[PDB]
Design an enzyme around this catalytic site. Structure first.
Site, short mmCIF file in Angstrom:
data_model
loop_
_atom_site.label_atom_id
_atom_site.label_comp_id
_atom_site.label_asym_id
_atom_site.label_seq_id
_atom_site.Cartn_x
_atom_site.Cartn_y
_atom_site.Cartn_z
N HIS A 14 -6.14 -7.02 2.66
CA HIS A 14 -5.33 -7.50 3.26
C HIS A 14 -5.19 -9.57 3.89
O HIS A 14 -4.18 -9.60 2.78
CB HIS A 14 -4.46 -6.71 4.89
N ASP B 125 -10.26 -5.25 -4.32
CA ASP B 125 -9.08 -4.25 -3.71
C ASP B 125 -10.28 -2.88 -4.21
O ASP B 125 -10.90 -2.73 -5.82
CB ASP B 125 -7.76 -4.29 -3.42
N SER C 98 0.80 -1.11 -0.06
CA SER C 98 0.23 0.38 0.36
C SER C 98 0.71 1.29 0.07
O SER C 98 1.72 1.23 -0.79
CB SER C 98 -0.80 -0.51 1.02
#
Ligand SMILES: Nc1ncnc2c1ncn2[C@@H]1O[C@H](COP(=O)(O)OP(=O)(O)O)[C@@H](O)[C@H]1O[C@@H]1O[C@H](COP(=O)(O)O)[C@@H](O)[C@H]1O
EC number: 2.3.1.-
Lengths: 523, 604, 414
Positions: free
Chosen positions: A225, A174, A114
């Site tokens: 995650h 995501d 990230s």
């Protein structure tokens, strides 16, 4: 042809680098610090994931400071980077620790998650975009990093041929990498993965279209995650797993079957409109074109066919420099008086058209990357340039307006000559053997433009007001050219044309000597 | 019968080879069996860690380069690169051919008796047999090819030995048809060498001990076998994926970037691999297709398939007896010959992606054949021969009648003949450069370099155009910018043609061109090796005092006679009155002027 | 000396006069066939057909030594490498027989060579209304106005051989009953300036103009409209601003103009004025660079027959209004390196008979040319042979000739 995006994704997945980078990222996140360690002879640097940071502001690359990007372009569209990423990189002092811990290393892999992935990408960009390439190779593998950059930055990276060192793994569920301003532009290869496989896209437009269609897709997830961990765990074991790959009804075509398999690997069925749109995007990702490997071999035939123009130019130069007037072939072409000048102009136009076509084909990516590394092509380009650049300069100055002093080295040089010079930059170190006689052609292709500029400066100095300070300044600006010309002449790196009795260089030297004798300046 | 039509080996010979391989377990070194008029040599298999990976080797894979003297033909003719083979297998072979073993005497006696020679073996020892076959192909077959001297190599689950260069060398010499390898569908021994030593070093001794049929009483550790199989499968998958990505010419920039960060086994299959299953027999002749099938066949299909695949793989290494006995009760199919391969691959368990990759690998050969056909059609054009005829029959005789060598005329002149000759030379150079690039990019069949017509055409083109190229190079004073012509100016195509011609003319003898030259003989990058480059040597020798360089002049004088005899240079044009060579020899002092051996060729 | 005199005794008086004319014409130079034919047409009133017949008849002997002459391809082609040279002995001969009359010299006024002096035989007789059917004056640095008065009450043909840079024009044309041919030749290495061009407007009977290597004066309304001028051939001239201006209508000034030739002339980026003439019949542009595209106003001309475009590089594309020409019999494009495609409607030219596109890098022939029924001869390269035979399949009468590329160094000499 053959669809290979899924093949490229499988090749990337099968490498141990995937698991090593994931483990390094997990360890860095657990420890909350930049972790540098050697695994299997490869130095992995994992940047921890930081949070409580806002993104979206675009300020641009730094211009003055410790960090610099000499390789980045500086045209009208200025490349821009995220302000938060740059601020974090400056605060964390990653550069000093990285350069201290990377002494003597041969293989370096930078990774992060990230914001950590964004910082790793920024660090890799800083390492690659320097005055000289780093002694070690780098590979920035990011795991769901947020989008950063701009259209100008992506275009400059593509032009610099540095996107091959960046890989990003983005899941199909995501939302962090898919939630960004439209000003942001993705760069580098992007891997879209899911529980049944992955695909690789190396086109900015294709990646943007995939992001758009995924945004339009109703299926979305918030926790990414654990999804990334499960995806990497289930993809590291894809080698020991063979599936049916039914794909519904298998098409009887290689390209269609490959596209259907790639669509099925992403978990999208061939019934919903989303699957059809994904198939269309995959089909449009790869364009149809003649194989570059065959085109590079075929280029020799048209090169040989255009060679007679160069032969005619050589014969014209020999005739001009063997003439009684001894005006030099440059001045002979500058003064349109004979039909041979028209024939040479036609040959020069044909050569310029052929080389422009070759350059356009090269920049289109219709040829292999190592096309410009070939010794034969470099030597042929050098031979063409050393013989055609003075002709182009003479033609430009003959067609130049009296009051439009744009010259040849002030924004009027064709880009093909710049590309040729960039290609010649890779030539090995020439031998320092002393030349017995004058070279056939002048080594410096820009000598005539500098001579014209010096002649203009000398004429301006001669025809002006008294202004002794102005004369001193103009002489100071002129004498570097005289020293350079004297050095070139003494080194015997110039052709006999510049040494002709009635050549322009001799006239300029005589005028300079007359001016010095008349007015009495030293040296 | 198609198996006998393609491989050339009958079922009885296969049974005899298997029996000899089984008997060789008790015997040491090698065992010789005389059945009828057939002599079969079976090599004893060895099961130890040191027998697969050489302890002295430092690389991640136990590979070492071959010796040019021992195997002159096991190299690339153009690039000059030598092949790499396993160190342990090569050492075992060298020990086998030791004179104390009397293997050479037995082989010579069998050859003198006009009997067919069959090399057989099992497991790693069988791989050694392959090397032995190559040794035979480098000792007797290449000396005088004949039907009676044709050997036969049969292996049962032998691991990979040579790299891609080895397979290319085998294909170029048309020797790949003599190798037959039987590999089970789930056999793990051929896949052992496709994995890095560091990944499987811990578990290699246990798996090797379990695979030994002599002592199967060792306790079975399922965890160790599972880990070994997982590592081998992962490495094989990586190697196969990289190979199939590189073969299709896709993601080349990504592959180039990732090559430095990856260490992959260079071993590639060599020979005709036939896969054996419960009721079918499939034979493949393409190395890439063989590798893809080898990777894809050993895969699971469901949960029931798992937890038993490693055990089946371990057991299948000793299941060749059933295949040999039941050879005649199974259907035989040729993958390359068949048009529809979907049914065969489905029966063998190949997935859809494996089918697509195999199809692409097969189509690559067809594309190469089409490229070769196009090149041949272009070469056989009338204008291509017309240009050479004009160069040979018009420019050279006219220059000779003009009392000036055509090399000197091309160096300096202002006639239309020189312009036409330069244009024709440029066109020929472009065509040959295109052909050379196609050959370099591995887009042509391996047999293309072995074509006699192509070699003759290249030799003629070199002998007719190379002096013109040297004259063009030295006319523009390019030697003062880069250096000598032979250092950084000689085109690659001329070197390739010269190497091909030398290999063609020296293959019946056995020595490399370097040996012949050095034996016949400061000479670094000299011109005494090529007759067509002699003019370039005259460029280098002229303009220098006699005292500084003397040995090169003597070497040139010695090689001039051989060059004239072989037709490399013509005494009518290069010994002309106006030739630069004559002027340079005139400038030479009187001592060598009177001590020169070609007086009868110069004095009038 | 005796042999060609005896041959002259066997020649017809008309062909004898023509032989004397060409022989006394200036030597050591290349003389185009068109100029020679025009001189014969306006001198002997024999017209082009009989002039060509006489040329063919005299080509047998060495007095008309021929050259390569590639004009055998078709009769619609112009003149290119068709120059004729003669021997200096023949020149002196043609100068010998009754060609040095002191005062009258009813025909054949000549000058042996360029010099700053005038013939003393005619210089002394300043007041001489001499019949001057053929006048050829060679003068170097001396003024063009001469030092006497040529009244020339019956002159028909005038040729001038000139030199130097700054020069004037004689007032002879002002005192001239009639004139049909006027030729000015400059042999300098730099453009030559001319002064006093208003005197040349006195006579409108002139039919041919052959200016070369000079500063073409700008057209003005004060110039008398030449209602009889038909040929204007400019080679290596300096247009500068003469043809660039469009305020004055060239059609009014030159209503009888039919053939205009511009060869080896630079600074010609503007062609609107040239296309503005409605009387144009045969336009030929050769070796003219610095031309992007032809102006889109050629529809005004409705009688153009030939469109020879030899060389002329940097031509991006052909005009789309070319297809609107009703009587475009001949189209010639050669040595073009920037043309990539012909007009889409190029096949609508029903009057097209012969087309030449040698050494032209054409990409793809449009299908419209399949309607070219009247097309007969095509001279092109080997590359376009396939798509020209595809037309030939439709029209059996179509003949295609492949032009081989010959490598010569004769251009370097010039
Ligand atoms: N100083 C140089 N200047 C310019 N060109 C050079 C120079 N040196 C070598 N070459 C050319 O570079 C190419 C290398 O391709 P090569 O297959 O080896 O590529 P690699 O395998 O190595 O990657 C060869 O064609 C060399 O050709 C020689 O140069 C003369 C002029 O050539 P011209 O016909 O264009 O006028 C020819 O007479 C040949 O002596």
């Amino acid at each position: 042809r053959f669809e290979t995006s899924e093949l490229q994704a499988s090749v990337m997945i099968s490498t141990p680098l995937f698991t090593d980078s994931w483990s390094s990222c997990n360890t860095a996140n657990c420890n909350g610090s930049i972790k540098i360690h050697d695994i299997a002879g490869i130095t992995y640097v994992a940047i921890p994931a930081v949070s409580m940071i806002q993104l979206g502001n675009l300020v641009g690359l730094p211009v003055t400071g410790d960090v610099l990007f000499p390789g980045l372009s500086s045209d009208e569209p200025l490349p821009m980077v995220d302000a938060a990423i740059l601020k974090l990189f400056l605060q964390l002092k990653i550069k000093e620790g990285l350069e201290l811990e990377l002494l003597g290393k041969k293989l370096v892999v930078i990774t992060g998650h990230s914001t950590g992935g964004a910082l790793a990408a920024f660090t890799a960009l800083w390492l690659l975009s320097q005055s000289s390439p780093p002694s070690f190779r780098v590979f920035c593998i990011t795991f769901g990093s947020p989008l950063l950059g701009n259209q100008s930055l992506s275009t400059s990276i593509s032009r610099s041929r540095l996107a091959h060192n960046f890989c990003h793994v983005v899941s199909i569920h995501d939302l962090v990498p898919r939630s960004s301003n439209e000003q942001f532009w993705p760069f580098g290869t992007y891997l879209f993965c899911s529980d049944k496989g992955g695909v690789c896209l190396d086109n900015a437009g294709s990646v943007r279209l995939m992001f758009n269609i995924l945004n339009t897709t109703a299926t979305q997830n918030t926790e990414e995650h654990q999804r990334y961990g499960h995806y990497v765990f289930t993809l590291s074991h894809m080698f020991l797993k063979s599936r049916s790959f039914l794909g519904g009804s298998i098409p009887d075509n290689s390209y269609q079957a490959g596209v259907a398999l790639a669509v099925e690997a992403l978990g999208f069925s061939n019934d919903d409109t989303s699957g059809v749109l994904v198939k269309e995007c995959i089909e449009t990702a790869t364009r149809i074109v003649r194989a570059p490997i065959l085109r590079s071999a075929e280029l020799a035939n048209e090169l040989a066919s255009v060679l007679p123009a160069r032969l005619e130019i050589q014969w014209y130069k020999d005739r001009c420099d063997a003439s009684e007037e001894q005006l030099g072939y440059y001045d002979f072409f500058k003064r349109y008086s004979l039909k041979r000048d028209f024939k040479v102009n036609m040959s020069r136009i044909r050569l310029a058209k052929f080389w422009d076509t070759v350059i356009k084909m090269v920049e289109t990516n219709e040829l292999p990357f190592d096309f410009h590394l070939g010794k034969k092509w470099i030597y042929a380009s050098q031979f063409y340039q050393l013989l055609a650049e003075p002709l182009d300069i003479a033609n430009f100055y003959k067609n130049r307006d009296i009051k439009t002093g744009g010259h040849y080295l002030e924004g009027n040089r064709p880009k093909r000559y710049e590309v040729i010079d960039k290609w010649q930059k890779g030539v090995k170190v020439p031998e320092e053997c002393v030349r017995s006689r004058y070279a056939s052609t002048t080594q410096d292709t820009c000598f005539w433009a500098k001579l014209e500029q010096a002649k203009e400066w000398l004429d301006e100095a001669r025809k002006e007001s008294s202004d002794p300070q102005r004369r001193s300044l103009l002489r100071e600006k002129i004498v570097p050219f005289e020293s350079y010309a004297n050095t070139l002449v003494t080194k015997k790196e110039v052709s006999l044309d510049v040494k002709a009795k009635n050549s322009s260089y001799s006239v300029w030297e005589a005028n300079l000597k007359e001016f010095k004798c008349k007015m009495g300046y030293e040296n | 019968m198609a198996f006998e039509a393609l491989t050339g080996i009958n079922g009885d010979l296969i049974t005899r080879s298997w029996s000899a391989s089984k008997q060789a377990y008790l015997t040491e070194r090698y065992h010789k069996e005389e059945a009828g008029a057939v002599v079969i040599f079976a090599f004893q298999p060895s099961f130890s860690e040191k027998d697969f990976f050489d302890p002295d080797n430092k690389s991640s894979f136990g590979e070492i380069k071959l010796n040019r003297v021992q195997f002159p033909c096991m190299r690339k003719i153009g690039k000059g690169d030598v092949a790499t083979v396993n160190e342990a297998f090569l050492k075992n072979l060298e020990a086998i051919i030791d004179p104390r073993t009397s293997f050479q005497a037995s082989v010579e006696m069998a050859v003198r008796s006009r009997k067919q020679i069959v090399f057989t073996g099992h497991s790693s020892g069988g791989a050694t047999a392959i090397l032995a076959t190559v040794w035979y192909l480098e000792k007797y077959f290449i000396r005088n090819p004949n039907v009676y001297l044709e050997p036969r190599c049969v292996t049962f689950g032998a691991p990979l030995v040579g790299d891609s260069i080895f397979s290319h060398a085998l294909g170029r010499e048309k020797w790949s048809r003599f190798f037959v390898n039987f590999v089970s569908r789930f056999d793990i021994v051929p896949r052992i060498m496709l994995a890095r030593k560091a990944s499987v070093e811990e578990t290699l001794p246990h798996v090797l001990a379990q695979l030994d049929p002599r002592k199967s009483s060792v306790q079975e550790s399922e965890q160790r076998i599972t880990e070994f199989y997982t590592r081998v499968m992962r490495d094989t998958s990586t190697v196969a994926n990289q190979a199939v990505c590189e073969l299709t010419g896709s993601a080349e920039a990504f592959l180039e970037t990732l090559s430095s960060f990856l260490e992959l086994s260079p071993y590639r299959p060599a020979g005709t691999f036939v896969f054996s299953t419960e009721k079918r027999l499939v034979a493949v002749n393409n190395s890439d297709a063989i590798l893809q099938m080898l990777f894809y066949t050993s895969q699971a299909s469901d949960e029931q398939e798992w937890s038993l695949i490693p055990f089946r793989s371990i057991r299948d290494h000793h299941s060749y007896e059933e295949l040999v006995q039941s050879m005649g009760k199974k259907l035989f199919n040729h993958l390359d010959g068949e048009n529809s391969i979907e049914s065969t691959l489905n029966d063998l368990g190949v997935s859809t992606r494996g089918r697509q990759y195999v199809q692409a690998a097969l189509e690559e050969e067809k594309k190469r054949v089409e490229n070769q056909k196009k090149i041949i059609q272009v070469i056989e054009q009338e204008r291509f021969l017309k240009k050479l005829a004009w160069i040979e029959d018009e420019y050279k005789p006219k220059c000779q009648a003009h009392k000036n060598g055509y090399y000197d005329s091309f160096k300096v002149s202002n006639e239309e003949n020189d312009f036409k000759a330069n244009v024709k030379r440029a066109e020929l150079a472009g065509v040959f450069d295109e052909v050379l690039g196609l050959m370099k990019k591995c887009q042509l069949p391996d047999e293309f370099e072995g074509d006699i017509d192509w070699i003759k055409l290249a030799t003629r083109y070199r002998r007719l155009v190379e002096p013109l190229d040297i004259a063009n190079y030295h006319r523009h004073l390019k030697n003062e910018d880069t250096g000598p012509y032979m250092k950084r100016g000689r085109p690659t195509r001329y070197i390739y043609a010269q190497r091909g011609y030398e290999h063609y003319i020296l293959k019946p003898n056995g020595m490399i061109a370097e040996d012949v030259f050095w034996n016949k003989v400061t000479l670094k990058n000299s011109g005494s090796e090529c007759g067509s480059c002699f003019w370039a040597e005259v460029e280098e020798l002229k303009g220098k005092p006699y005292e500084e360089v003397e040995v090169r002049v003597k070497t040139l004088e010695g090689m001039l006679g051989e060059w004239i005899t072989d037709g490399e240079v013509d005494d009518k044009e290069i010994f002309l009155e106006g030739s630069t060579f004559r002027k340079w020899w005139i400038t030479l002092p009187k001592n060598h002027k009177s001590h020169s051996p070609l007086r009868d060729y110069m004095m009038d | 000396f005796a042999h060609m005199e005896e041959s002259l005794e066997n020649l017809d008086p008309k062909i004898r006069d023509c032989f004397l004319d060409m022989g006394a014409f200036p030597e050591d130079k290349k003389i185009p066939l068109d100029l020679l034919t025009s001189v014969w047409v306006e001198r002997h009133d024999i017209d082009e057909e009989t002039a060509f017949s006489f040329v063919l008849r005299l080509a047998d002997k060495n007095l008309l030594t021929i050259v390569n002459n590639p004009r055998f391809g078709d009769v619609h082609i112009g003149y290119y490498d068709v120059f004729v040279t003669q021997h200096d002995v023949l020149r002196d001969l043609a100068l010998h027989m009754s060609n040095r009359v002191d005062v009258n010299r009813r025909e054949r006024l000549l000058m042996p060579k360029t010099e700053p002096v005038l013939p003393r035989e005619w210089e002394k007789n300043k007041d001489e209304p001499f019949d001057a059917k053929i006048v050829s004056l060679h003068t170097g640095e001396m003024d063009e106005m001469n030092w006497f008065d040529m009244d020339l009450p019956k002159a028909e043909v005038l040729i001038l051989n000139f030199s130097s840079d700054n020069y004037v024009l004689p007032p002879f044309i002002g005192k001239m009953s009639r004139l049909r041919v006027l030729v000015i030749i400059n042999n300098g290495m730099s453009p030559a300036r001319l002064h006093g061009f208003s005197i040349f407007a006195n006579l409108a009977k002139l039919r041919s103009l052959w200016l070369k290597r000079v500063h073409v004066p700008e057209l003005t309304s004060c110039t008398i409209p030449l209602k009889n001028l038909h040929k204007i051939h400019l080679i290596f001239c300096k247009v500068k601003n003469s043809f660039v201006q469009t305020s004055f209508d060239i059609s009014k000034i030159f209503p009888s103009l039919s053939d205009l030739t511009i060869d080896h002339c630079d600074d010609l980026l503007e062609l609107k004025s040239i296309f503005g003439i409605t009387s144009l019949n045969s336009l030929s542009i050769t070796n003219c660079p610095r031309i992007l595209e032809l102006p889109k106003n050629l529809s005004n001309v409705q009688s153009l027959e030939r469109l020879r475009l030899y060389a002329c590089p940097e031509l991006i594309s052909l005009p789309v209004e070319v297809c609107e020409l009703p009587c475009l019999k001949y189209v010639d494009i050669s040595q073009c390196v920037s043309l990539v495609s012909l007009p889409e409607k190029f096949g609508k030219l029903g009057s097209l008979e012969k087309i030449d596109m040698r050494e032209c890098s054409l990409l793809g022939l449009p299908s419209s040319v399949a309607a070219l029924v009247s097309l007969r001869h095509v001279i092109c390269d080997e590359e376009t042979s396939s798509m020209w035979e595809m037309v030939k399949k439709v029209v059996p009468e179509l003949c295609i000739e492949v032009a081989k590329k010959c490598f010569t160094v004769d251009w370097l000499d010039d």
